[PDB]
């Protein structure tokens, strides 16, 4: 029933690389690190592969969800009582046909073909677990988010979830400490203030004098939304200019970002790590802004902090972009994938742990005779969806 | 008098506040960050650690390198019972080395969920590695609560025979 351009339908194979201390690589109890893309065995073809902070969620062609990684807060949405079960792909018991998934640091969301949203795990703030849908309570199994309207897209930051409805309304829930929910006053940022967590955990609409949206994206602690008119709105953390020049380190009130006022430009994609943002326009050009350390902007060596989207010139036409905590990626129209940023966790796929201040094409045995369909990255690992 | 600036970093809810409280006035040296002076008596004289509880400001604040500048040592803390808190350890480690260089750093695995005795499996992964000195700690019996400070003190003073009294 529901549909959105963000939905993925091309069947592929899942590859992972980086650190796997808690099972996020999905390669078994003793594979703690992969310097180059490694094939993950899944019983079916996969259409979407998302990296949470320390876990991975894959969606099969048939609409079944598989997960692996840290399940301490219930993020995997399945029983991992047996030692090692979290280190390999396992099915999420959900008798629904899922069309899209999203993953945060301790939560996972799944969108059903008819527009219902299921969620599991928990949200955390700067003082610990705040709960999932009910105060101070996580859920080890999928629970439905109560909404009286169909949702067409789900997107997750580290500890917040955004849901775009069929009507263009944007609902948000989770941690709003940095303003990433775009509907809570700074006065209630800390666990809802005197009124409590209820306000943060109950899905509520982002109301702007009302503006409707056609797409939305999440960085670690901030959110971008494109209105029906094509205007770019943002809210959340901007201490390193990840939202441009909001005029504040924490943007609680959604703002029409001046740093993104086009004319002939049409922004089509946004991604973000903790302190940087990577976006792309309708012409296949990629741009970055925010903190420059360790080369996460991909603008070359000597790069400095940027407050406006800056063109990443060393890249061919791009079809999609993605960010890890301190790394950036771009998938080209021709099916190649480039990476840049901090190399410490081996997320670059260069084989080395040196930082890359400029985009570098990922190469490896598992990438030969295959095209990259998508890339998603977490705190210490990265996940690729490829096809022959 | 021997005094050291110690930076304490870690995800929220990993027990940083409780950790400091149990070793106890405090003062503000900057925005959103309280400093708690801790004095340890030893066989080499008193040693004071001025503990900066960054409280996530390194992630959300605007002092940039200001949180780490002039730090002589550090403690990176995470929750061994909620391992997603280990996510930023590499970033904290890189930043500390970039801003302070080769300062001594201790990684502390805090057992916050003191209700599940299979932490000797969730923690095994951290005793391994080796780049950083690791210690298992827990609010309750102040298990190894002094270990991190003792290790740092020995490295800072350059006396392997240093002992807390």
UniProtKB/Swiss-Prot annotation, chain A:
Keyword annotations: Cell cycle, Cell division, Chromosome, Cytoplasm, DNA-binding, Guanine-nucleotide releasing factor, Methylation, Mitosis, Nucleus, Phosphoprotein, Repeat
Subcellular location: Nucleus; Chromosome; Cytoplasm
Gene Ontology CC terms, in alphabetical order: chromatin; chromosome; condensed nuclear chromosome; cytoplasm; nucleoplasm; nucleus; protein-containing complex
InterPro entries per UniProt: Ran_GTPase-activating, RCC1/BLIP-II, Reg_chr_condens
UniProt KW Transferase keyword: no
Miscellaneous section: Patients with Raynaud disease produce antibodies that bind to RCC1.
The protein's name in its UniProt record: Regulator of chromosome condensation
From Swiss-Prot, chain B:
The organism's place on the tree of life at top rank: Eukaryota
Outcome of substituting residue 17 to N: Has low binding affinity for GTP and GDP. Decreases nuclear import of proteins and RNA. Stabilizes the interaction with RCC1. No effect on nuclear location during interphase
Top-tier EC class: hydrolase
Function in brief: GTPase involved in nucleocytoplasmic transport, participating both to the import and the export from the nucleus of proteins and RNAs. Switches between a cytoplasmic GDP- and a nuclear GTP-bound state by nucleotide exchange and GTP hydrolysis. Nuclear import receptors such as importin beta bind their substrates only in the absence of GTP-bound RAN and release them upon direct interaction with GTP-bound RAN, while export receptors behave in the opposite way.
Consequence the record notes for mutating residue 57 to N: Unable to hydrolyze GTP. Increases binding to BIRC5 and promotes exaggerated spindle formation
Protein name: GTP-binding nuclear protein Ran
One term of GO molecular function: GDP binding
Modified residues (N6-acetyllysine): 25, 48, 59, 87, 122, 147
Principal place of residence: nucleus
Post-translational modification: Acetylation by KAT5 at Lys-122 is increased during mitosis, impairs RANGRF binding and enhances RCC1 binding. Acetylation at Lys-25 enhances the association with nuclear export components. Deacetylation of Lys-25 by SIRT7 regulates the nuclear export of NF-kappa-B subunit RELA/p65.
Modified residues (Phosphothreonine): 17
Taxonomic source organism: Homo sapiens
Region described as Switch-II: 56-72
Result for mutant: residue 122 to R: Loss of normal mitotic chromosome segregation and formation of sister chromatid bridges
Top-level taxonomy: Eukaryota, Metazoa, Chordata, Craniata, Vertebrata
């Amino acid at each position: 029933k529901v549909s959105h351009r963000s939905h993925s339908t091309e069947p592929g194979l899942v590859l992972t690389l980086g650190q796997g201390d808690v099972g996020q690589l999905g390669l078994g109890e003793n594979v703690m690190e992969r310097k180059k893309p490694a094939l993950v065995s899944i019983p079916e073809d996969v259409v979407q592969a998302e990296a949470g902070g320390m876990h991975t969620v894959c969606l099969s062609k048939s609409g079944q969800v598989y997960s692996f990684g840290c399940n301490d807060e219930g993020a995997l949405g399945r029983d991992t009582s047996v030692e090692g079960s979290e280190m390999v792909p396992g099915k999420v018991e959900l008798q629904e046909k899922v069309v899209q998934v999203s993953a945060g640091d301790s939560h996972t969301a799944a969108l059903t073909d008819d527009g219902r949203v299921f969620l599991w795990g928990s949200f955390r703030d700067n003082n610990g677990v705040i709960g999932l849908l009910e105060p101070m309570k996580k859920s080890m199994v999928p629970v439905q988010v109560q909404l009286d309207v169909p949702v067409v897209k789900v997107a997750s930051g580290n500890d917040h979830l955004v849901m775009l409805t069929a009507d263009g309304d944007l609902y948000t829930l989770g941690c709003g400490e940095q303003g990433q929910l775009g509907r809570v006053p700074e006065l209630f940022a800390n666990r809802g203030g005197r009124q409590g967590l209820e306000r943060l955990l109950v899905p509520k609409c982002v109301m702007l004098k009302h503006v409707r949206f056609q797409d939305a994206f999440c960085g670690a602690y901030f959110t971008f939304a494109i209105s029906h008119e094509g205007h770019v709105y943002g809210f959340g953390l901007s201490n390193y200019h990840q939202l441009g020049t909001p005029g504040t380190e924490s943007c609680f009130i959604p703002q029409n970002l001046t740093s993104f006022k086009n004319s002939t430009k049409s922004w089509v994609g946004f991604s973000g790590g903790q302190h940087h943002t990577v976006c792309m326009d309708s012409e296949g050009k990629a741009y970055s802004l925010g903190r420059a350390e360790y080369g996460r902007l991909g603008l070359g060596e000597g790069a400095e902090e940027k407050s406006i989207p800056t063109l990443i010139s060393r890249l061919p036409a791009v079809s999609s972009v993605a960010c890890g905590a301190s790394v950036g990626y771009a998938v080209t129209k021709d099916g190649r994938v480039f990476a840049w940023g901090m190399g410490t966790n081996y997320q670059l796929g260069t084989g080395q742990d040196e930082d890359a201040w400029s985009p570098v094409e990922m190469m490896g045995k598992q990438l030969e005779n295959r095209v990259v369909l998508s890339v998603s990255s977490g705190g210490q690992h990265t996940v690729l969806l490829v096809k022959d | 008098q021997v005094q050291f600036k110690l930076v304490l970093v870690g995800d929220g809810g990993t027990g940083k506040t409780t950790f400091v409280k149990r070793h106890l006035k405090k003062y503000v040296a900057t925005l959103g960050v309280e400093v708690h002076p801790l004095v340890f008596h030893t066989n080499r004289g008193p040693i004071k650690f001025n503990v900066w509880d960054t409280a996530g400001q390194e992630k959300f604040g605007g002092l940039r390198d200001g949180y780490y500048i002039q730090a002589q040592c550090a403690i990176i803390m995470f929750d061994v019972t909620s391992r997603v808190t280990y996510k930023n350890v590499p970033n904290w480690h890189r930043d500390l080395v970039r801003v302070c260089e080769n300062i001594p750093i201790v990684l502390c695995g805090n057992k916050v969920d003191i209700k599940d005795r299979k932490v000797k499996a969730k923690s095994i992964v951290f005793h391994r590695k080796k780049n950083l000195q690791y210690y298992d700690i827990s609010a309750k019996s102040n298990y190894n609560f002094e270990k991190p400070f003792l290790w740092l003190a020995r490295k800072l003073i350059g006396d392997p025979n240093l002992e807390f009294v």
